[PDB]
Amino acid sequence: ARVKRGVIARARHKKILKQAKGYYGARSRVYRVAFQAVIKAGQYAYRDRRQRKRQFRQLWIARINAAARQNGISYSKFINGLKKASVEIDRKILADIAVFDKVAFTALVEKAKAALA
Amino acid sequence: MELVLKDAQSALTVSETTFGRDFNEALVHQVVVAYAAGARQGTRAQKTRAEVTGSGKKPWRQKGTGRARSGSIKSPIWRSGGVTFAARPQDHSQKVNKKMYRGALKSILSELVRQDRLIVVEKFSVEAPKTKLLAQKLKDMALEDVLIITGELDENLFLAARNLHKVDVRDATGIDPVSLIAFDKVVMTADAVKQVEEMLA
Amino acid sequence: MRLNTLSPAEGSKKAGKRLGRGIGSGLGKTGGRGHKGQKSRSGGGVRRGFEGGQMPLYRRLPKFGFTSRKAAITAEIRLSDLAKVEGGVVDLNTLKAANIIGIQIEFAKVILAGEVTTPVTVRGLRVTKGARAAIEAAGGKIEE
Amino acid sequence: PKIKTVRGAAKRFKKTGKGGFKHKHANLRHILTKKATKRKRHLRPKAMVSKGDLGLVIACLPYA
RNA sequence: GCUUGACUGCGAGCGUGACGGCGCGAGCAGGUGCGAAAGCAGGUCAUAGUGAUCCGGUGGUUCUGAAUGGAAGGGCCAUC
RNA sequence: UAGCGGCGAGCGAACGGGGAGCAGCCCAGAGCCUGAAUCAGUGUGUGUGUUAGUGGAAGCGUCUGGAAAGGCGCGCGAUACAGGGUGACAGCCCCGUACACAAAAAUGCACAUGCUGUGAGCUCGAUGAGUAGGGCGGGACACGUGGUAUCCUGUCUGAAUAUGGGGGGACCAUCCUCCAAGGCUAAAUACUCCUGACUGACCGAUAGUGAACCAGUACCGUGAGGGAAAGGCGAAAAGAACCCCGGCGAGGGGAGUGAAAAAGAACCUGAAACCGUGUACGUACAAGCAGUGGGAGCACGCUUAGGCGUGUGACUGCGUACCUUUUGUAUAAUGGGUCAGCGACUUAUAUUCUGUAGCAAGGUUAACCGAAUAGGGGAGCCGAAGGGAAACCGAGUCUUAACU
Ligand SMILES: [K+]
Ligand SMILES: [K+]
Ligand SMILES: [K+]
Ligand SMILES: [K+]
Ligand SMILES: [K+]
Ligand SMILES: [K+]
Ligand SMILES: [K+]
Ligand SMILES: [K+]
Ligand SMILES: [K+]
Ligand SMILES: [K+]
Ligand SMILES: [K+]
Ligand SMILES: [K+]
Ligand SMILES: [K+]
Ligand SMILES: [K+]
Ligand SMILES: [K+]
Ligand SMILES: [Mg+2]
Ligand SMILES: [Mg+2]
Ligand SMILES: [Mg+2]
Ligand SMILES: [Mg+2]
Ligand SMILES: [Mg+2]
Ligand SMILES: [Mg+2]
Ligand SMILES: [Mg+2]
Ligand SMILES: [Mg+2]
Ligand SMILES: [Mg+2]
Ligand SMILES: [Mg+2]
Ligand SMILES: [Mg+2]
Ligand SMILES: [Mg+2]
Ligand SMILES: [Mg+2]
Ligand SMILES: [Mg+2]
Ligand SMILES: [Mg+2]
Ligand SMILES: [Mg+2]
Ligand SMILES: [Mg+2]
Ligand SMILES: [Mg+2]
Ligand SMILES: [Mg+2]
Ligand SMILES: [Mg+2]
Ligand SMILES: [Mg+2]
Ligand SMILES: [Mg+2]
Ligand SMILES: [Mg+2]
Ligand SMILES: [Mg+2]
Ligand SMILES: [Mg+2]
Ligand SMILES: [Mg+2]
Ligand SMILES: [Mg+2]
Ligand SMILES: [Mg+2]
Ligand SMILES: [Mg+2]
Ligand SMILES: [Mg+2]
Ligand SMILES: [Mg+2]
Ligand SMILES: [Mg+2]
Ligand SMILES: [Mg+2]
Ligand SMILES: [Mg+2]
Ligand SMILES: [Mg+2]
Ligand SMILES: [Mg+2]
Ligand SMILES: [Mg+2]
Ligand SMILES: [Mg+2]
Ligand SMILES: [Mg+2]
Ligand SMILES: [Mg+2]
Ligand SMILES: [Mg+2]
Ligand SMILES: [Mg+2]
Ligand SMILES: [Mg+2]
Ligand SMILES: [Mg+2]
Ligand SMILES: [Mg+2]
Ligand SMILES: [Mg+2]
Ligand SMILES: [Mg+2]
């Protein structure tokens, strides 16, 4: 029962090389190099599903800070004020409102300031 | 336990142990596998590094050439080299305990009765050693793929069945577990049933 | 019941280990041998009873005893064997004929093991105190 | 082929009813005058092979 | 001063060792010494003073004894 | 197992049992008697095989197609549906196959009866000497000199010879058993350079022979010796008339053949590395494992016209390959230029444990017989009893004079 490897080996190599499309040089052409590139791409993608959540929160906070300071209050006081006012709107939504509805954002700041006063 | 004869319409009495027992799949499986293992010829070989034709000269010196170290041109790493674990001829036959063999046959025969695949007749024969006669007889009986078991194997029936690939004609002593399962129907003469009864008990 | 509807019993056919076929198997690379040393090697490992060079147990302990040739030609008969002979007389030859003892056995002893429930004459065998009581209680007799 | 008994082990161990092994004690061959009678008396009866050593003995005596 | 307990067979139980081993031990049987007796004595205030197995030697022995009776050799106990 | 054994590593019987097969004779010598038994060489009939051969059943229509053996329909043979071939897969087209037959000549074999040599039967007698045995040295016996029987003999010796002699594992006695120093002998057993037939959970061109091919060749070596690579057009050569560019080239474009010519002989399929042409997008102020998360712009598709898809990826967060070996490696430690193909826990037997199946105080057979995967075969093996070094005793036994 001699087994030739060619058909299965080809399919495995092609599966990896397909995942390496777009990579530079040997990384999209050469199995040995492409395999390492694909594993590393997977490692980074795993890491960066966690980092994405950090990076977006960082961005939302920076924008809330800018919008809050245009309305005469720091980010840190603003968040404290909203919590004392029992407002549960999260940072993704606050940052969205900061950009797209300036008047509504001002109303949130006034709510925060009233809770602090 | 009784089996009605199709031609005669009598009632042949048989033991519950042989023809009425439960199907033991695990036991039957072992015996069927053993039977197929018994059919293997097991004739093959490859050449180890000892058996490949060539010199025992070391291909190049141990050190200094910048090549991987080599010892034999017959190394299994090398093209044209030996097979690492070269096959030899093997005996693939298994032991089947006598009682497990007999137990498997009783399970099979009992299951053929439950599935209405065992057909008992008083007699089964042909006038002349003519395939056309047996082919017509099986057409009359609504049989196609059939194992025919006789008490004594007729020469006319043997010769008539030989060129029909769907049909096989055996004596009762020449039953085997795979053949009872493989054919769609099993026709037994009354005399064959008694010999099989006596054989298995 | 067809050749493609038979299965083995659950648990009856465990798959063999295959070493050195990659990470996922759990036996890749070193094949369960660990790292280096004599035991990792092809043909590697020390002989039976070897303890690293310390005088091994089977040499630091003394030899004792001798083997008796008489023991090899002496058998024990159970009470349950007494009924297995043909014709109700138990002696060496009838025990040999019944395949109870080997043909080269020259001496035999009936012991209190199992039961005797029939009258048996025992001739030319030793019998234990307990076996004698059991044989005599079943209406048997013992002849030296 | 058949496993070969370690013949030196067969001269030093005998299998008991529950599958342990009896052996003769060491230290009662010679240099006996200096040994207390108590010590020698306790070395006379046969002893059982310890748990740690059973694996070694069993390997040596496959037909015990 | 009188003595041979520096006893023989055993040993509940325990300590210490990977193991081989080593250690402590009331008490039981037999026979003993000392003392008036209770009692004590199985070496020495204790902890070093030691060498496995093999091979063989010596003495003993209700064991074995290659046709049988013996014997040789072997075993077992003591010891080198 | 018993034993042997620096009692180490290891070596390893026999007795006895079950089978296959089976067969007994002659000389060491005269007599009587005829040449009776039977083995060889040389004949010649009788079969029976071998070396060429002979006959050997039964199918058409229609659909797809380059082609039908395929599909569909309706028939027929089968002691033949083994197998091979034929323009795709054929019981019925071809070659076969089952079955039935055949030899002028040579020849194996088996019996038959000649001739030639060979002599059986019977009674009486005989019964293997430099031998057995020994001393010395060595070797062989499972047995290593050991308490070492037995066998062989290089060396030195040396019996009794049937009222005798050998052996029974030191040795002696007793008893039993056999007759050395002369020889022949079928079968069961071993093997395959070679011939025929058939088979394979054997390989399928880096495999399988080293060798599918003009291979023990080319080639290497003074020589012994070493020793490759290399298979496939198509159903059929129908292997491309003729024309055109070119050197009366190479190579190509047409034409033609063909089902197909990116089947055109550098020929089935035609992967990958590697190298190009074309198009989209990015890229000449920008620093590092080259990705990943975010992300504009552009191009091209789709179209609830909201968006989506595909390619690209400005800019930006994070981010020092893999294997190995290590306390620890981005490591400036190891290994890999890349791709494709191959390349490493197997096999046999024994043994123990687990799972599972059978049968159960029983379980199971080996060789072998059997045409038999059956059935027979229970020789054996394991288990149902242990204790003791052992004799031995035995649900106990050993220890000890004897056990609380
Ligand atoms: K048939
Ligand atoms: K392991
Ligand atoms: K006392
Ligand atoms: K057709
Ligand atoms: K055909
Ligand atoms: K001589
Ligand atoms: K004699
Ligand atoms: K070669
Ligand atoms: K080759
Ligand atoms: K980036
Ligand atoms: K290192
Ligand atoms: K280095
Ligand atoms: K196993
Ligand atoms: K099992
Ligand atoms: K006891
Ligand atoms: Mg293949
Ligand atoms: Mg590519
Ligand atoms: Mg090869
Ligand atoms: Mg059988
Ligand atoms: Mg692991
Ligand atoms: Mg390693
Ligand atoms: Mg290490
Ligand atoms: Mg290790
Ligand atoms: Mg090696
Ligand atoms: Mg028997
Ligand atoms: Mg001693
Ligand atoms: Mg105790
Ligand atoms: Mg020695
Ligand atoms: Mg004797
Ligand atoms: Mg003798
Ligand atoms: Mg002695
Ligand atoms: Mg024909
Ligand atoms: Mg084709
Ligand atoms: Mg003679
Ligand atoms: Mg002699
Ligand atoms: Mg001599
Ligand atoms: Mg001699
Ligand atoms: Mg000599
Ligand atoms: Mg010698
Ligand atoms: Mg010796
Ligand atoms: Mg003698
Ligand atoms: Mg001789
Ligand atoms: Mg080749
Ligand atoms: Mg190919
Ligand atoms: Mg030359
Ligand atoms: Mg062709
Ligand atoms: Mg041209
Ligand atoms: Mg083709
Ligand atoms: Mg091609
Ligand atoms: Mg630009
Ligand atoms: Mg600048
Ligand atoms: Mg720029
Ligand atoms: Mg740069
Ligand atoms: Mg993204
Ligand atoms: Mg960075
Ligand atoms: Mg280091
Ligand atoms: Mg690091
Ligand atoms: Mg560097
Ligand atoms: Mg490096
Ligand atoms: Mg290194
Ligand atoms: Mg390198
Ligand atoms: Mg016992």
User: Concatenated DSSP letters for chain A?
Assistant: -----HHHHHHHHHHHHHHTTT--GGGGT-HHHHHHHHHHHHHHHHHHHHHHHHHHHHHHHHHHHHHHHHTT--HHHHHHHHHHTT----HHHHHHHHHH-HHHHHHHHHHHHHHH-
Q: How far is CA A35 from the centre of its chain?
A: 26
Six token digits for residue C91: 């002696």
* CA dist., res. A67 & res. A82, Å (int): 15
**Exposure b/e, A23-38, CB count within 10 A at least 16 = b:** beeebbeeeebbbebb
A64 to A52, A97, C129: CA distances (angstroms) = 18, 9, 105
Nearest to B177 by CA among B70, B34, B4: B34
Q: Measure the CA–CA gap between C102 and C93, rounded to whole angstroms.
A: 10
Instruction: Tell me how close the Cα of B36 comes to any Cα of chain C, in angstroms.
Output: 11
Q: Burial-class residue C5 by CB neighbours within 10 Å (0-12, 13-18, 19+).
A: exposed
CATH number of the domain residue C120 falls in: 3.100.10.10
Domain that holds residue B83: 2-200
Structure obtained using: cryo-EM
Strand F nucleotides, any atom under 7 Å to a protein CB? 1-5, 7-12, 15-17, 77-82, 199-211, 216, 225-229, 271-274, 289-294, 311-313, 317-318, 321-322, 324-326, 336, 338-352, 355-359, 361, 363-366, 371-381, 384-396, 399
For the CA atoms of B190, B192, B198, C2, the dihedral, rounded to the nearest 10 degrees, stands at: -110
Instruction: Give CA–CA dist C8/B28, Å, rounded.
Output: 9
Q: Are strands D21-23 and D47-48 parallel, antiparallel or unpaired?
A: antiparallel
Q: By the 8 A CB rule, do B140 and B180 touch?
A: no
Contacts of C16 (CB under 8 A, 6+ apart): none
Tokens representing residue B85 in the block: 């674990």
> What is the SS3 assignment for C32?
coil
Question: Which residues are C80's β-sheet partners?
Answer: none
Nucleotide in closest CA–C1' contact with C128: F394
C-alpha count within 13 angstroms, C-beta hemisphere, residue B35 = 19
Cross-chain Cβ contact D24/C57 below 8 Å: no
Q: Strand B118-121 and strand B185-189: pairing?
A: parallel
What was the resolution (in A) of this experimentally determined structure?
A: 1.6
Plot region of B165 (φ>0 → left; ψ -120 to 50 → alpha; else → beta): alpha
Q: C98 and C86 in contact (C-beta within 8 Å)?
A: yes
Tell me the CATH number at B174. Answer: 3.40.1370.10
With DSSP H G I counted as helix, E B as strand and the rest as coil, what are the percentages for chain C, rounded to 5? 20, 15, 65
Contact B168, B143 (CB under 8 A): no
Domain extent at residue C128: 70-142
CA angle B62, B67, B72 (to 5 degrees): 55
Tokens representing residue B30 in the block: 């072992």
Q: Which residues contact B55 (CB under 8 A, 6 or more apart)?
A: B73
Residue B5 CA to residue B13 CA, distance in Å, equals 11
Taking every pair of C-alpha atoms in chain C, what is the biggest distance, in angstroms?
76
Taking alpha carbons only, the member of B1, B12, B5, B25 closest to residue B120 is B5
Distance CA B179, CA B162 (A): 16
The residues facing B13 across adjacent strands are B2
Residue D8 CA, nucleotide E74 C1', distance (Å): 17
CA C77 to chain centre: 17
Instruction: Tell whether the torsion through CA atoms of C27, C31, C37 and C43 is positive or negative.
Output: positive
Q: What is the 3-state secondary structure (H, E, C) of chain D?
A: CCCCCCHHHHCCCEECCCCCEEECCCCCCCCCCCCCHHHHHHHCCCEECCHHHHHHHHHHCCCC
Whether residue C87 contacts residue C94, with contact meaning beta carbons closer than 8 Å, is answered with yes
Q: How far is C46 from chain B (nearest CA, A)?
A: 24
**Count of the separate structural domains present in chain B:** 1
Rounded distance, CA D26 to CA D47, Å? 10
For residue B159, the number of C-alpha atoms closer than 13 Å in the C-beta half-sphere is: 8
Q: What are phi and psi of B65, to 5 degrees?
A: -85, -20
Residues 10-39 of D with CB under 8 A from C: 11-14, 23-26, 28-29
Pairing of β C121-123 and β C89-90: parallel
At residue C123's C-alpha, the angle toward residues C121 and C128, to 5°, is: 85
Return the closest-CA partner of residue B114 out of B7, B29, B20. B20
Q: In sequence order, what E strands does B38-130 have?
A: 118-121
Q: Tell me which amino acid residue C123 is.
A: R
Which class for B159: exposed (0-12), middle (13-18), buried (19 or more C-beta within 10 A)?
middle
| Amino acid in the structure at residue B193 | V
> B120 in helix, strand or coil?
strand
Planar angle of CA C36, C37, C39, nearest 5 degrees? 105
CB of C42 within 8 Å of a chain B CB? The answer is no
Q: Is the Cα dihedral C19, C21, C24, C29 positive or negative?
A: positive
- Burial label, D58 (beta-carbon count in 10 A; 0-12, 13-18, 19+): middle
CA D24, distance to chain mean position in Å, is: 5
Instruction: Give the separation between CA A109 and CA A102, rounded to whole angstroms.
Output: 11
Alpha-carbon distance values, A20 to A6, A9, A10, A25, A46 (Å): 21, 17, 15, 11, 17
Set of chain C residues whose Cβ sits within 8 Å of the Cβ of D11 = 63-64
The Cα-based distances of C23 to A19, A37, C26 in angstroms read: 21, 19, 6
Instruction: Compute how many other C-beta atoms are within 10 angstroms of the C-beta atom of residue D18.
Output: 6
Question: Would you say A84 and A117 are in contact if contact means Cβ atoms under 8 Å apart?
Answer: no
Determine the Cα–Cα distance for residues D24 and D45; give it in Å rounded to an integer.
Answer: 7
- How far, in Å, are A32, B130, B139, B140 from residue B136 at the CA level? 68, 10, 5, 6
Q: Which of C58, C63, C64 sits opposite D60 (nearest CB)?
A: C58
- Amino acid at the residue C49: G
Q: Compute the nearest-CA separation of C116 from chain D (Å).
A: 25
Helices (H), chain B: 16-19, 25-39, 98-114, 131-140, 155-161, 177-182, 190-200
Spatial distance between the Cα atoms of B146 and B124, rounded to a whole number of angstroms: 13
Angle (nearest 5°) at CA C4 between B199 and C9: 75
* Vertex A67 angle, CA A63 and A73, to 5°: 120
Chain centroid to CA B131: 25
Contact partners, residue C141, CB within 8 Å, separation at least 6: C119, C121, C122, C135
Does any CB of chain B come closer than 8 Å to the CB of residue C34?
no
Contacts (Cβ under 8 Å, ≥6 apart) of C109:
C74, C75, C76, C77, C125, C126, C127, C128
A98 CB-contact burial (10 Å; exposed 0-12 / middle 13-18 / buried 19+):
buried
Helix (H, G, I), strand (E, B) or coil at B46: coil
Return the structure tokens found at D35: 């040994």
